Symmetry: D2
Subunit: 410 residues, 4 copies
Amino acid sequence: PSLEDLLFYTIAEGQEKIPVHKFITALKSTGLRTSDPRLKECMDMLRLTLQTTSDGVMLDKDLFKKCVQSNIVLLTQAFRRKFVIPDFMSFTSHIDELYESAKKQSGGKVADYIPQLAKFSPDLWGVSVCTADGQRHSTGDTKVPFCLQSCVKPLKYAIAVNDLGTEYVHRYVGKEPSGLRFNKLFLNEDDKPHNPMVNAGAIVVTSLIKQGVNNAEKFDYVMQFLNKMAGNEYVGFSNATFQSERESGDRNFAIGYYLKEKKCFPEGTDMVGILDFYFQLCSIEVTCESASVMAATLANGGFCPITGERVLSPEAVRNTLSLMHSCGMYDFSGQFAFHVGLPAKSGVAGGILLVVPNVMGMMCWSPPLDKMGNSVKGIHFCHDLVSLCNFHNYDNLRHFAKKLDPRREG
Amino acid sequence: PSLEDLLFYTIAEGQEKIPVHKFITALKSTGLRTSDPRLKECMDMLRLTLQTTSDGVMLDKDLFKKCVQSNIVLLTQAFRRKFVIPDFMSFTSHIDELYESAKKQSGGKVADYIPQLAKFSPDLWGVSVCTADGQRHSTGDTKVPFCLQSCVKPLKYAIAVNDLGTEYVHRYVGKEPSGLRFNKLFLNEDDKPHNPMVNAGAIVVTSLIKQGVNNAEKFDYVMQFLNKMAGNEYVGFSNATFQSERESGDRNFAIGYYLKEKKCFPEGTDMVGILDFYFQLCSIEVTCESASVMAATLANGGFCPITGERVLSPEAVRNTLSLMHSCGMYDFSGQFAFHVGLPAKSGVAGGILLVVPNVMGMMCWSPPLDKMGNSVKGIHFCHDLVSLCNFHNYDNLRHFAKKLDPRRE
Amino acid sequence: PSLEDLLFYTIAEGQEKIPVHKFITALKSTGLRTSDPRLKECMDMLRLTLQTTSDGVMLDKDLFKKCVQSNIVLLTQAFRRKFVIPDFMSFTSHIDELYESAKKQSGGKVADYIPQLAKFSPDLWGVSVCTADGQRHSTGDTKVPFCLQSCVKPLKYAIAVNDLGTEYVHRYVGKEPSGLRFNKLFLNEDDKPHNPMVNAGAIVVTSLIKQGVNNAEKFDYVMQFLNKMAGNEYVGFSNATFQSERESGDRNFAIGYYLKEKKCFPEGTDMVGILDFYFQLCSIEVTCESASVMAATLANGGFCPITGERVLSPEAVRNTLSLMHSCGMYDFSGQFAFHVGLPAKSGVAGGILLVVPNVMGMMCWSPPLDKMGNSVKGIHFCHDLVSLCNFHNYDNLRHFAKKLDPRREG
Amino acid sequence: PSLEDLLFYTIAEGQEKIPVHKFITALKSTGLRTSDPRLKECMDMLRLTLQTTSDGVMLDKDLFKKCVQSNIVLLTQAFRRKFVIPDFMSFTSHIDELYESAKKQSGGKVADYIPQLAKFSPDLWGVSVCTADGQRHSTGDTKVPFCLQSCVKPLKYAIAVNDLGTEYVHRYVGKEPSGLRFNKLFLNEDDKPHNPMVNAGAIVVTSLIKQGVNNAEKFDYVMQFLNKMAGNEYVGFSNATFQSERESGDRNFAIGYYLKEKKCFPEGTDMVGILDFYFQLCSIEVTCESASVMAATLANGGFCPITGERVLSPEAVRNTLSLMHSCGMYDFSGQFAFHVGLPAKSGVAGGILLVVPNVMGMMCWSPPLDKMGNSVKGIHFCHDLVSLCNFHNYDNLRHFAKKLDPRRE
Ligand SMILES: CC(=O)Nc1nnc(OC2CCN(c3nnc(NC(C)=O)s3)CC2)s1
Ligand SMILES: CC(=O)Nc1nnc(OC2CCN(c3nnc(NC(C)=O)s3)CC2)s1
């Protein structure tokens, strides 16, 4: 027997040779993107034989064997329905409906405190999915760059725990939510910030990453890291947003000094310098698509799903998801944890980084925020998604009532 | 082909006939207990034929099929290792290691606030498991009855949400935790108690269950409900514990009166009676074993695993596990949710009712409490369990480092 | 020489005999009331000679000497303008103006949570003055009985420290105000109520007065005490108010149980009985006139000014004035101390018991309360009073700008 | 008859001529200092006459009248015991006892966070009095200059209310104390600092004084203002303290940035400059003697008692005495108001500027502080002072038990 050969008969349909487009659309219908890095050898060989023989465009058992041999393990799982969402075409149909249902929630106010997010239109709205297996789907304004802002706080924490361990990082920052009107305090009772998703704890976590090196190499260190998470999709940097964040951050300058007085930073910290590195990290740019790969990396126990690369330790990813559950959505965290039950993180540009552990990661984006600071459409989408699918943290995988389960088939 | 016949050769091992004891030990090793209610029919036919011919005790293809046809699907799943933990024999060996490792933590102080918990010895310690499929195992003092106390709070919240729905119950109680030094407040800013796991909200939740009937019928209704949840295993009641909570509950009278003044109960409430009903509910008795079935009922989306009965709506169970995750372990809730990541609920008699969703439910019991109020051995066990198995809520099921996974082979 | 003889020529106005009405009007104009207990002998002797010599009504040097001998010291000080307010006639004209200026502030809501405080008309308004010397003046509805309610807290605190001393009493109750959003807390951080003017602390103090005896003698012990303080003017008791306060006091029962749990009472306290005794003390009745004598006794270092009787130790009065200054007007305490600067206490019936140390006591009464719980007209009257006179605690007795000083003349 | 003549016989004692020393000693025993500014003409004429007739040194009815006519009303009041404390010689004997009783309380820790307050000896200790009439007395280290630090907060609040009025100033700062552990907060619920005695509110008040002018002239205005208040006694500036206060005042920058974000300042303020101006004001230097005259100006309705000039409006003095009563001694404020009953203000150098309204002002100084931040010897002295004299705010001026009253004979 032979794996390349048995896969050949599945797509051959008893016939003699497979047209290339018939193989291409069969492969794309699994949700894989024809530009998947795990598929580069297969696609390079296909492009070559489509030159070598204008005499086509048909592959026999032996010619198909030449192309798919290099990536046969991933292609077989994709064609024999072994992916975490087996019927991806029906699932994306559902994502499209949920998107259109949220597209009608036109309330909210765009963050206006800086001219660079006031520039963004309230009609933008996109959602990108990326499963723990690499299946992609987008709808809407998903290639528009926008800043992570507070969406970057869980990614920084993951990098800090990945490099320093849990016990070290949690000398300097706590692990609990604060309480629905302890939002205005910087420190909990141990004179540590309450947790990494809070501004005071985000700043302290920022002062742990790559100490001893200067602000240019730290920024390089974190961006190289964010590239691995996104399978080398778009990660950028807005100097416009950063220069404004620098000139309008009196609240954070207040935090920095209060943290200096109470000896919250590591010894030898340049507090004002850490504030620049902090403002920088909030001005990193993503699209919906590139961020949906980041979120899926946390969804996937730390391995980027479109490269197979190990990016974060299981200890760093578990801690980040734990803190996104309960501290992730500003004052909505408690209500969100109850009704949605997913690790999520919101931002002022309109991002919501959403992780369905063991299934997929997502990024929703609509600039207009409601009064607690979360994208109006994004929050609507997240409620709708969990009403439809048994992805809630404490839904049952066996007795889930009237919800659909995309991890099953019939 | 034939499903009863194929199982016969599976356990017969090509041989002539199955001894009766060889079938029972084969069955017990799947984790099923020979008294499972879903197996009563099979066990009745065995009880009949073990009289029919003392010239035995051997079952032919036809005689084995005589007993097992009634329960063949459940027996096939158990023998083709389709149960949520396929190698149950090995997993219980690990539970024994974790139990013995916690048995050496003799620190802590027994709750003495009532003479009925001061009389319980610091040497007691039991652990019971019940998987979403019915596989059972116990170690230690697992049949000694004890009161739930605050372990009962998630169970009554489930009943209330099961009968009245989420929107109603949460007109009267919040959904968030309060904050690590907001423990001393009764109400949040919307004038509802913070959540059903704290005393002020447990008191309010109690005033919602089965309104319009008197306190004796209310209590009977909750006992009937707690019976369905434990697959009819041990549920009792201590009149002694009830009398001491009654005569020493000035704090609960303080809460009750504060809630009456700020109009937190549903209209037509006899506040003083509801405290009596509340004190009663805290004095319900369980054993480790019976409660581990209750926990598995939450683990199993609302269906009791040793009877298959639908006991709670999926909405009541999802809400209860949500609120146990973040509010279940007193001031330890935050540290606990981070490190263990399992919905749990603790009590002052020393209980910790523990849920691993889609896998199993658990009950630990050791009377000596730490300074935050949680059983010392019980907390030690929960850390060790999650350190060993990828049961943490935000462990990944595919890339889980050097932890063991009891769901695979 | 002779005091009876020189006071004789003071009123004689060079003629030979004094009409009786001419002496009485001279006496009333000092503000003394012709029924002052320190004047009983003089008034009895005057009424007697108006029977024995109907051939009058005129008194010579020797007949004047017959009547005023007994109370000549009090009469001389009154006639030689030696009283704390020498020109009482002019001062009462001002009290009348201040009264009329507040009669025009008809806002507020009468307290309605029990039927007997809702029954009071919103148009009642009275104010009574009583100096440390006994000079009286009233305007408005000054003889209508009403309940003290929270006005009783400074009087029972004074009774407790008069019998037990400060250090004993302040084992069970603090001495500071709480902070404008520590209002809902019962205990401070030492597990004592914050101070005697708050409900939780008034209840605890009630549990220190006259321990070991039952509720009837306790009530008698306190009423006799209030009688001495008011120079035997009207002190009464509403059983109606007590019955409604009792069956509608769920927060006070809430306080009682919380205080039992945290062991705030003395050993052997019958907590529910102390709540009965507390409700009773809140339903004791006064009129404006009778309550204004109470206030002056605190103004007067503990000596009731119309009987000369020592009623409270100087330690008890100093402490009670200290706490009325900072805790007496509910959430208005800080604003009141700042702008009025007088020891004062308010109640839900509409009373404000007011003390100007070393000068006078006062009681204002108008049932309509403002949104913090204080009589609207009463608070208005207090601001007006101190804008007019240098009575504010930290006004200067020498350089007081354009304010009037009733303690001086020209 | 004649005012200069009757005064002459008062001190002449029927004799022929008054020696010069006999008059100077008579004058000092009234407590006036032979250098009072209100006595300059009289002392100039004495210094003028002490040269012409070295064949003296004794004054006739006419030569005494030569000098004293210019200041006759002040001298007569002092000699017919019309001063607020008629028997000053006996009163200072009592302050000497109180000083000596506190000198035996050697506990406390000198402020260490800057090298300029660690340099001061733990055994320095001074007390100075100055009455509303100008009678002076000191015991101890009363001419050693030290920084006001937070003692300057009431003086600048007074300047601000004196120049702009109460309604304007209290748009930017509240008027209550905060709550015994609401100390860690900067703003109340109205987004104003709680009151001027607090760091967050002193910072805001600093931003209202003389707006629109630069930091050098602003500082000159405040020094000119402090000079009128101390009757031109010693006021200085420590540049060392100012350099260390700015280079270690991270909490103050935290306050400034938080106050800037919540728009607490008036329009057009350079927040970073106002922190410099604030640090400067905290480094103003005084001695015990000079600062107690400042206190006497507050005691005296705004008129400096040793020059007679009006320095502050009565509205400003009342408000500052109001806020010093309740906020002046950090976490000790409530306790202090209850037990001492005097408006006072403390500072980290160890000063306590204390006001007994309508009688006298005071300044105590001993560097070793409490754990709440107040001078130990200074706090002890204030308690002792009020146990002795009926100066407590709510003492009775008529029925005051066994306490002494320095205002009577
Ligand atoms: C606006 C209002 O009404 N109140 C206020 N809210 N926030 C304010 O800003 C500061 C609060 C004080 N600081 C603290 N952080 N954590 C603390 N707890 C401990 C145990 O250290 S204290 C820094 C921020 S003031
Ligand atoms: C720790 C300390 O110093 N004092 C105290 N600690 N606990 C106390 O119990 C009482 C607190 C006051 N009441 C309230 N409950 N919830 C509330 N929430 C809101 C938003 O109003 S207010 C009744 C219980 S007092």
